[PDB]
Amino acid sequence: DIQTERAYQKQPTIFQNKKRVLLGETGKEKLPRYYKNIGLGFKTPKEAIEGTYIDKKCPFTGNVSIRGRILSGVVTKMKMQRTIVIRRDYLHYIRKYNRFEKRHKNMSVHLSPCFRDVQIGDIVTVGECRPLSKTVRFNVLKVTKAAGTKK
Amino acid sequence: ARGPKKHLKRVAAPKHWMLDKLTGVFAPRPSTGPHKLRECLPLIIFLRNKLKYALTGDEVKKICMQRFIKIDGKVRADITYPAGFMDVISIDKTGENFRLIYDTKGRFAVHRITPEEAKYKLCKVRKIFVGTKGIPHLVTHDARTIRYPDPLIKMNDTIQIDLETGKITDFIKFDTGNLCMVTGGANLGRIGVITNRERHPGSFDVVHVKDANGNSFATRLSNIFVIGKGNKPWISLPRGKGIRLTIAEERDKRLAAKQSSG
Amino acid sequence: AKIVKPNGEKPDEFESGISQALLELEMNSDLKAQLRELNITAAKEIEVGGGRKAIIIFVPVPQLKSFQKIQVRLVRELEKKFSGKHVVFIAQRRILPKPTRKSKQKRPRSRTLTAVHDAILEDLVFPSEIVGKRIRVKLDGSRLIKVHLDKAQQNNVEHKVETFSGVYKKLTGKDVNFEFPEFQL
Amino acid sequence: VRMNVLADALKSINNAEKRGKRQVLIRPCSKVIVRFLTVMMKHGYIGEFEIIDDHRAGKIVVNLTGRLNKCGVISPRFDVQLKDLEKWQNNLLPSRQFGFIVLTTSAGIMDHEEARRKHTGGKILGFFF
Amino acid sequence: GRMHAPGKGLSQSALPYRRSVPTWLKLTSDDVKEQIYKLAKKGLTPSQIGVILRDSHGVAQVRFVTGNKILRILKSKGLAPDLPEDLYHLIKKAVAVRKHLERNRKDKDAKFRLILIESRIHRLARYYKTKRVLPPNWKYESSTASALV
RNA sequence: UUAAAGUUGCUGCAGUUAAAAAGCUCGUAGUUGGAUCUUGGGAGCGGCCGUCCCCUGCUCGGCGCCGGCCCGAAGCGUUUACUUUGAAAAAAUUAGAGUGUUCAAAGCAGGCCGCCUGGAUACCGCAGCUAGGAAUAAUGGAAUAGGACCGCGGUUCUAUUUUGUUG
């Protein structure tokens, strides 16, 4: 399930080759997991604690920090891997005609494999990060399901 | 611009530099120092507009390098030296000292002080650092790196330093019930007591300050200077004690002074 | 005893007296065929406007459908055992606060204030069901509700309309006048 | 189909007031309609107005008198501020000595002088004079 | 007015204000429950169950006696139809119209009515998708019309 | 080029005959969408009413006392638009306070006989940050009960304050 590509995937905080007294069983083969509290009142989920995925851009198990703006949006498409596009619908005001117009500005955010219970239409919130790609700047902090989907 | 700017236009100057328009094209850009450009005051501006000791830009230079003016116990020979909040300035020969405190409006004010009060200076700690061989460090709001401080000095406290030895004598803790004043913004020079301190994670932590007569206002965390422990101030406050008289009471006071003067 | 309470508190002497009177009434009559499981929750005596009083019995809602076939004789036995006080069966219902943005599942519309007040008004007049209802708004801003009843079962109800108006004024706070129009039948 | 019930109610009562009748059959019911008619009653423009209870939709019968010039609706609901309301009473009210502008407020459906003295504002509803 | 016709007709029911069971009715809630169960086991639309009950049993409204309508009873027992009845009737009408047109090519107004009922089917299917009654992948097409119930 | 132009019309134009309703219908994006959810009360002043107070739950403590009460607080409380306040929002310029440049456009000066001053204030569309209310408009709670609540019954990983010193 893991180690797909031409290089080893590891978390460069822990040491995965500690020498035990025996190197047998009963205390070994449970590797430690690196995680941190991202702050701003957000709570880390269990999937980032007991998971086995390896990332370098995950807000929980990764080398990226959260600072700046906190936004929200609705998930539109899940086609490209490990990152999704959300839609922000907002209203614009004109001084001349005292009437509003709705506008949308879709943009790409990053989805770690910690949140894999995501379908089209789920409301997510994002936080500003350093540029992780050409057009990707935001990391998803939590996921909220839409109406229905009771299964 | 391929490099740093070296000129400064007259109408691009800050308003608290308190200049005129139809005098010259340029304004005195201060040399880099402890204080920022928009929050300091050049020595030429003070000596040529406030104290009226000099009239031109050469007389200020003659007085400045004549070794007559001492800045926080050190003689300075730069005519555009940045002087900011509670910069103790001394004239040794005529025996006068001035303390720079913001008055009831948004500006500086001349304030003659006794020499016994001119020996020390209240200043605000900015951040706490740890040195090379486990030495704690303090960074002060006028960039005074002090080695080995008191263990009870926190991030937003105020320390009192003797100008002859550079060490800490006494301190004020950041807590509600202490006399405070604001340095910057719409509020400036008002003296009040801290009551509330609202914590916002990831942004500016606003506080609430009540005046001694019944007025209240809210400023940011960076716009805080603690000056007293309770009601008694540790320094000599200027005239009016920083009460921020409104325009009606100011008009009434000016009319009363005009009627009494005749 | 006969009286039970959803709240864990001992009933007072008046409702215990009403429960004992009901137990005696089913003891010396044929009411025991229909009161083995049916009971009483609470009772209250309130000053109906004038020189005459009346009692109000709080009944749980799912037992009122069983009582709906029984009120033909219980009421007349209750004025005949008493002196002249009328008896009114008002079901108990819980009034829930509106779910605001400050203060968990859905509060249903059956538990809303308007619904329980209309249900109290409906259970207030059992033999005379609702045929018309009007609201009067006077110049003071107050609301004067009016209730129109059928021309069936008039003579046994027309002497208790002021009792219904008094107990509806005390329980809710709305002035209700009862009238008998001759429209349909 | 129908969009605003207040617009139809105000047009119906305006037509029946211009024809000179005394009773108006407002066929919809709403909280805003009852509150608007209550404000018009409190400011001495109408009399005893009814609410006919029904399990479908209530009907309102008002007691007209020769006192109303025109009552109207401003559709859609335009939000105002305290300083913005002065232009609205400049171009909507016929005079400053009389006339009223009813605007929606968090304190309830309530007129413009009271919203001025309570230091507030909100969406507009209509006008009467 | 109608959604596909210029008519402005006003002809419908008129429920009375009186919210009470009639005293002369001798049908309890249980008896009308197995009456509805038997009429649904006979293979009837709930409207047919309602008209049969109101004619031959003297009940005014079922939800005024039982406490809920017919489709709630049929869903609670477990014998309600999979497809709703009005959209099923619209589908069967569309199949009847199409079996007229591909037997009789030259008619045009019947093709116009076919377009109208296809639009009605599409709008009702969109509403049932919005109400999460139909599956989201449900799609009506002519090529599986007569194969569909 | 602006006003006059209500001859560009959001406020605020016209479409039978003067310029102008597609031949008709369905239909996607857009725009607009019915009723319905907490009413009413009390302590009092002026004499029923225009101003006053009351009708979200829980782990640590200072305004007071004799393990028992109130006050506060590390920390959480369904989300939007709208509305009021607060922060910050360069100067000059626009209103605007003071001031006999001989008035004014100006300018930030000046007045008493060393002394006393001023060098304010408002505005800064929208968007981002905050604090009282939820009337107005849109979403969601449970119907296949994978609904709340109450005390019980089984499966696991980890905390030093202890089974006489220490292993």
Short mmCIF file of N, CA, C and O in Angstrom, two decimals, chain C residues 43-101:
data_model
loop_
_atom_site.label_atom_id
_atom_site.label_comp_id
_atom_site.label_asym_id
_atom_site.label_seq_id
_atom_site.Cartn_x
_atom_site.Cartn_y
_atom_site.Cartn_z
N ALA C 43 -54.10 18.65 40.28
CA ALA C 43 -55.34 19.40 40.41
C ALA C 43 -55.01 20.79 40.94
O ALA C 43 -54.00 21.00 41.61
N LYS C 44 -55.89 21.75 40.62
CA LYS C 44 -55.69 23.12 41.06
C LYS C 44 -57.04 23.81 41.16
O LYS C 44 -57.91 23.64 40.29
N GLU C 45 -57.21 24.59 42.22
CA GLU C 45 -58.40 25.41 42.43
C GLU C 45 -58.04 26.86 42.19
O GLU C 45 -57.10 27.38 42.79
N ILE C 46 -58.79 27.52 41.31
CA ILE C 46 -58.48 28.89 40.91
C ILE C 46 -59.76 29.71 40.99
O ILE C 46 -60.87 29.19 40.82
N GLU C 47 -59.61 31.00 41.30
CA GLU C 47 -60.74 31.91 41.46
C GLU C 47 -61.25 32.28 40.07
O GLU C 47 -60.71 33.17 39.40
N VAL C 48 -62.29 31.57 39.63
CA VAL C 48 -63.05 32.00 38.46
C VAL C 48 -63.81 33.27 38.82
O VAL C 48 -64.38 33.38 39.91
N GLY C 49 -63.77 34.26 37.92
CA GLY C 49 -64.32 35.59 38.14
C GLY C 49 -65.78 35.65 38.55
O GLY C 49 -66.68 35.31 37.77
N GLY C 50 -66.02 36.09 39.79
CA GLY C 50 -67.32 36.13 40.41
C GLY C 50 -67.27 35.47 41.76
O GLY C 50 -66.20 35.33 42.37
N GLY C 51 -68.44 35.05 42.24
CA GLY C 51 -68.56 34.36 43.51
C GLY C 51 -68.48 32.86 43.43
O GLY C 51 -68.74 32.18 44.43
N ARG C 52 -68.13 32.31 42.27
CA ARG C 52 -68.10 30.87 42.04
C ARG C 52 -66.71 30.45 41.60
O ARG C 52 -66.04 31.15 40.84
N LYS C 53 -66.27 29.29 42.08
CA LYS C 53 -64.96 28.74 41.78
C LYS C 53 -65.09 27.51 40.88
O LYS C 53 -66.19 27.03 40.60
N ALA C 54 -63.94 27.01 40.45
CA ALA C 54 -63.88 25.80 39.64
C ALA C 54 -62.52 25.15 39.83
O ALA C 54 -61.55 25.79 40.25
N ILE C 55 -62.45 23.85 39.53
CA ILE C 55 -61.22 23.08 39.66
C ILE C 55 -60.73 22.68 38.28
O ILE C 55 -61.53 22.51 37.34
N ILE C 56 -59.41 22.57 38.13
CA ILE C 56 -58.77 22.17 36.88
C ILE C 56 -57.97 20.91 37.15
O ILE C 56 -57.13 20.89 38.06
N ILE C 57 -58.21 19.86 36.37
CA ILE C 57 -57.46 18.61 36.46
C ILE C 57 -56.49 18.53 35.30
O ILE C 57 -56.89 18.64 34.13
N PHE C 58 -55.21 18.32 35.61
CA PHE C 58 -54.18 18.08 34.61
C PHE C 58 -54.13 16.59 34.30
O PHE C 58 -53.93 15.77 35.21
N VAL C 59 -54.33 16.24 33.04
CA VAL C 59 -54.40 14.86 32.58
C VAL C 59 -53.29 14.68 31.55
O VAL C 59 -53.01 15.61 30.79
N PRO C 60 -52.58 13.55 31.54
CA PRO C 60 -51.65 13.28 30.43
C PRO C 60 -52.39 13.14 29.11
O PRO C 60 -53.56 12.73 29.06
N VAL C 61 -51.71 13.52 28.03
CA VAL C 61 -52.34 13.53 26.70
C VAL C 61 -52.79 12.16 26.18
O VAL C 61 -53.91 12.08 25.65
N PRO C 62 -52.02 11.05 26.32
CA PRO C 62 -52.53 9.80 25.71
C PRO C 62 -53.68 9.17 26.47
O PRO C 62 -54.32 8.24 25.95
N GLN C 63 -53.97 9.63 27.69
CA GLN C 63 -55.12 9.16 28.45
C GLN C 63 -56.37 9.98 28.18
O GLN C 63 -57.46 9.59 28.64
N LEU C 64 -56.26 11.11 27.47
CA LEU C 64 -57.44 11.92 27.19
C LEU C 64 -58.30 11.31 26.10
O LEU C 64 -59.52 11.55 26.07
N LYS C 65 -57.71 10.53 25.20
CA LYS C 65 -58.49 9.82 24.19
C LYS C 65 -59.36 8.75 24.82
O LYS C 65 -60.48 8.48 24.35
N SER C 66 -58.87 8.12 25.89
CA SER C 66 -59.69 7.20 26.66
C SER C 66 -60.77 7.93 27.45
O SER C 66 -61.90 7.44 27.58
N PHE C 67 -60.44 9.11 27.99
CA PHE C 67 -61.41 9.91 28.73
C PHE C 67 -62.46 10.56 27.83
O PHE C 67 -63.49 11.00 28.34
N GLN C 68 -62.21 10.62 26.52
CA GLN C 68 -63.09 11.34 25.60
C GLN C 68 -64.46 10.66 25.47
O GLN C 68 -65.45 11.32 25.14
N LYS C 69 -64.53 9.36 25.72
CA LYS C 69 -65.79 8.64 25.72
C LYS C 69 -66.43 8.55 27.11
O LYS C 69 -67.49 7.93 27.25
N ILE C 70 -65.81 9.15 28.12
CA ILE C 70 -66.20 8.92 29.51
C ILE C 70 -66.81 10.16 30.17
O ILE C 70 -67.63 10.02 31.09
N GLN C 71 -66.55 11.37 29.65
CA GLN C 71 -66.94 12.63 30.29
C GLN C 71 -68.44 12.92 30.34
O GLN C 71 -68.84 14.00 30.77
N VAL C 72 -69.28 11.98 29.87
CA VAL C 72 -70.72 12.19 29.88
C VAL C 72 -71.27 12.18 31.31
O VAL C 72 -72.18 12.94 31.65
N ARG C 73 -70.70 11.34 32.19
CA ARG C 73 -71.24 11.15 33.53
C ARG C 73 -70.33 11.64 34.64
O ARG C 73 -70.83 11.99 35.72
N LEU C 74 -69.01 11.66 34.40
CA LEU C 74 -68.05 12.08 35.42
C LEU C 74 -68.26 13.53 35.83
O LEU C 74 -68.18 13.86 37.02
N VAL C 75 -68.56 14.40 34.86
CA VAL C 75 -68.76 15.82 35.16
C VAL C 75 -69.99 16.02 36.05
O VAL C 75 -69.90 16.68 37.09
N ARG C 76 -71.11 15.36 35.72
CA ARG C 76 -72.35 15.55 36.47
C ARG C 76 -72.24 14.94 37.86
O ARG C 76 -72.76 15.51 38.84
N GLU C 77 -71.53 13.81 37.99
CA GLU C 77 -71.21 13.28 39.31
C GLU C 77 -70.31 14.24 40.09
O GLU C 77 -70.40 14.29 41.32
N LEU C 78 -69.45 14.99 39.41
CA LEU C 78 -68.55 15.89 40.13
C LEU C 78 -69.24 17.17 40.60
O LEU C 78 -68.88 17.70 41.66
N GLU C 79 -70.23 17.71 39.86
CA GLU C 79 -71.00 18.78 40.52
C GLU C 79 -71.98 18.22 41.55
O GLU C 79 -72.35 18.94 42.49
N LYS C 80 -72.46 16.99 41.39
CA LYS C 80 -73.42 16.49 42.37
C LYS C 80 -72.74 16.09 43.68
O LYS C 80 -73.35 16.20 44.75
N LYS C 81 -71.49 15.64 43.62
CA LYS C 81 -70.76 15.37 44.86
C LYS C 81 -70.29 16.66 45.53
O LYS C 81 -70.27 16.75 46.76
N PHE C 82 -69.93 17.66 44.74
CA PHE C 82 -69.55 18.96 45.27
C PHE C 82 -70.80 19.81 45.47
O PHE C 82 -71.93 19.33 45.36
N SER C 83 -70.61 21.10 45.77
CA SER C 83 -71.75 21.99 46.01
C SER C 83 -72.22 22.63 44.71
O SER C 83 -73.37 22.44 44.29
N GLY C 84 -71.35 23.40 44.06
CA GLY C 84 -71.69 24.03 42.80
C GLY C 84 -70.51 24.27 41.89
O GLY C 84 -70.65 24.90 40.84
N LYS C 85 -69.34 23.77 42.27
CA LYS C 85 -68.13 24.05 41.51
C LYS C 85 -68.06 23.17 40.27
O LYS C 85 -68.27 21.96 40.33
N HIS C 86 -67.76 23.80 39.13
CA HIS C 86 -67.60 23.08 37.88
C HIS C 86 -66.21 22.47 37.79
O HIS C 86 -65.25 22.93 38.42
N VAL C 87 -66.10 21.41 36.99
CA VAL C 87 -64.85 20.69 36.80
C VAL C 87 -64.46 20.75 35.32
O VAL C 87 -65.31 20.62 34.43
N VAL C 88 -63.19 21.05 35.07
CA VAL C 88 -62.66 21.23 33.72
C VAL C 88 -61.44 20.33 33.57
O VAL C 88 -60.54 20.35 34.41
N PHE C 89 -61.41 19.54 32.49
CA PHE C 89 -60.29 18.65 32.18
C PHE C 89 -59.40 19.35 31.17
O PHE C 89 -59.77 19.51 30.00
N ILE C 90 -58.21 19.77 31.61
CA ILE C 90 -57.22 20.42 30.75
C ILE C 90 -55.98 19.54 30.72
O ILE C 90 -55.39 19.24 31.76
N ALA C 91 -55.59 19.11 29.52
CA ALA C 91 -54.43 18.24 29.38
C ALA C 91 -53.14 19.01 29.64
O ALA C 91 -53.02 20.19 29.30
N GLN C 92 -52.16 18.34 30.25
CA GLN C 92 -50.85 18.93 30.47
C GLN C 92 -50.03 18.77 29.20
O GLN C 92 -50.15 17.77 28.48
N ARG C 93 -49.24 19.80 28.88
CA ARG C 93 -48.35 19.82 27.73
C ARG C 93 -47.14 20.67 28.07
O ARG C 93 -47.24 21.65 28.81
N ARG C 94 -46.00 20.30 27.51
CA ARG C 94 -44.75 20.99 27.78
C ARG C 94 -44.49 22.04 26.72
O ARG C 94 -44.59 21.77 25.52
N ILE C 95 -44.16 23.25 27.17
CA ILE C 95 -43.87 24.38 26.29
C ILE C 95 -42.36 24.49 26.16
O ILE C 95 -41.67 24.76 27.15
N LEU C 96 -41.86 24.29 24.95
CA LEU C 96 -40.41 24.30 24.81
C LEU C 96 -39.93 25.64 24.28
O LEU C 96 -40.63 26.26 23.47
N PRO C 97 -38.77 26.11 24.74
CA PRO C 97 -38.22 27.36 24.20
C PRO C 97 -37.80 27.21 22.75
O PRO C 97 -37.49 26.12 22.27
N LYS C 98 -37.82 28.34 22.04
CA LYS C 98 -37.41 28.37 20.65
C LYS C 98 -35.91 28.12 20.54
O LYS C 98 -35.13 28.72 21.29
N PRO C 99 -35.46 27.23 19.64
CA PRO C 99 -34.02 27.01 19.48
C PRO C 99 -33.34 28.19 18.81
O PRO C 99 -33.47 28.39 17.60
N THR C 100 -32.62 28.98 19.60
CA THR C 100 -31.97 30.18 19.11
C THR C 100 -30.54 29.86 18.66
O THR C 100 -30.14 28.70 18.58
N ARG C 101 -29.77 30.90 18.36
CA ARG C 101 -28.38 30.73 17.97
C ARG C 101 -27.43 30.71 19.16
O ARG C 101 -26.23 30.49 18.97
#
